[PDB]
Amino acid sequence: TDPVKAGYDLAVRMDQVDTSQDSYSEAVMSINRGGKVLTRSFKTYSKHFGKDGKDEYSLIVFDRPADVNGTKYLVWSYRGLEQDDDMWVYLPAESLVRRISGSSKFASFMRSDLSNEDIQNLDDVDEYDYLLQGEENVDGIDCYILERTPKKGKETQYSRQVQWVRKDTLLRLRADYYDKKDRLVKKLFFSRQEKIDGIWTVTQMRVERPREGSFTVIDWSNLRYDVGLSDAYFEHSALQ
Ligand SMILES: [Cl-]
């Protein structure tokens, strides 16, 4: 058995879970740093695009609290490595649109434990090399242990990611992220999964940055698939 080919084959199966053309969801994010808490409420709109409908466009609209109300992120995430993912943010305080590109992708997303790059396609299969390490029972759940390393030349802050993948739903249960100095930079917990409109979806996450002394908890609700979203939500004009 080839663990590199087996790792890639699993990554492909994982990428087949999302059979939707578009989706809508609502989320609340709570960021904890030394007992101090920041909160954000947002709606996410997503729709598939491209020749084979493999590109994914997303619009993230913040509504609460008052200081972040009106912040919008537009993401044009492309299948393949030929074109870098496009990302823009509309900032309500300066009524400006700013492109997030290059190393800006590694910066914090809305002061959370997520980076701007964490907001793009989590399952871009051909951006990585895989290694299936085996199986392990994690708190009563049977998982595959799947390591993925970014291919040479990929713009990312991570050197490698260890993923615990549920054998039954093919959703991640946990993942460890490593920086360019091989240090553990982030711990992800996919703490809740739900079958929504026939698609097993992560609907709760805890993201920890052990080096920052902070953790983010995100709760998704009112998630729906194939609602018939217009292309207007994903145009550069939807920002300003
Ligand atoms: Cl700019």
Domains of the chain (ranges; CATH) run 1-240 (2.50.20.10)
Resolution reading in Å:
1.8
Are 87 and 74 spatial neighbours (Cβ–Cβ below 8 Å)?
yes
Residues with CB under 5 A from ligand 1 (ion): 98-99
How do beta strands 214-225 and 199-209 pair?
antiparallel
Residue 91 Cα, ligand 1 centroid: separation in angstroms? 12
Side-chain half-sphere CA neighbours of 223 within 13 A: 19
Map tokens 């802050």 to a residue. Answer: 157
Q: State how far the Cα of 87 lies from the Cα of 59, in Å rounded to an integer.
A: 10
Q: What are phi and psi of 18, to 5 degrees?
A: -80, 95
Task: Calculate how far, in angstroms, residue 86's C-alpha sits from the geometric centre of ligand 1.
Answer: 12
Rounded to whole angstroms, the Cα distance separating 210 from 64 reads 27
Q: How far is CA 43 from the centre of its chain?
A: 15
**Are 52 and 21 in contact, with CB atoms under 8 Å apart?**
no
Task: State the distance from the centre of ligand 1 to the C-alpha of 199, rounded, in angstroms.
Answer: 37
| Ligand 1 centre distance from Cα of residue 98 (Å) | 4
CA–CA separation, 131 vs 232, rounded Å? 40
Is 40 within 8 Å of 110 (Cβ atoms)? yes
**Phi–psi pair at 140, nearest 5 degrees:** 85, -10
Query: How far apart (Å, rounded) are the C-alpha atoms in residues 40 and 62?
Result: 7
Residue 10 phi/psi, 5-degree rounding, is -65, -50
- 57: CA distance to ligand 1 center in Å? 19
* The Cα angle at residue 41 between residues 23 and 191, in degrees rounded to 5: 70
CA 19 to each of CA 15, 76, 100, 199: distance values in angstroms, whole numbers, following the listed order: 9, 19, 29, 7
CA angle 165, 145, 217 (to 5 degrees): 50
Distance 151 CA to ligand 1 centre (A): 27
**C-alpha 72: how far from chain center:** 16
Any long-range contacts for 177-180 (C-beta under 8 Å, 24+ apart)? Answer: none
Nearest alpha carbon to residue 192 among 220, 165, 216, 164: 220
CA-nearest of 51, 46, 102 to 75 is 46
Experiment used for this model? X-ray
Mapping DSSP onto H, E and C, the string for the chain reads: CCHHHHHHHHHHHHHCCCCCCEEEEEEEEEEEECCEEEEEEEEEEEEEECCCCCEEEEEEEEEECCCCCCCEEEEEECCCCCCCCEEEEEECCCCEEEECCHHHHHCECCCCCCEHHHHCCCCCHHHEEEEEEEEEEECCEEEEEEEEEECCCCCCCEEEEEEEEECCCCCEEEEEEEECCCCEEEEEEEEEEEEECCEEEEEEEEEEECCCCEEEEEEEEEEEECCCCCHHHHCHHHCC
d(CA 97, CA 236): 10
And the tokens for 26?
Answer: 């609502």
Q: Are strands 158-166 and 172-179 parallel, antiparallel or unpaired?
A: antiparallel
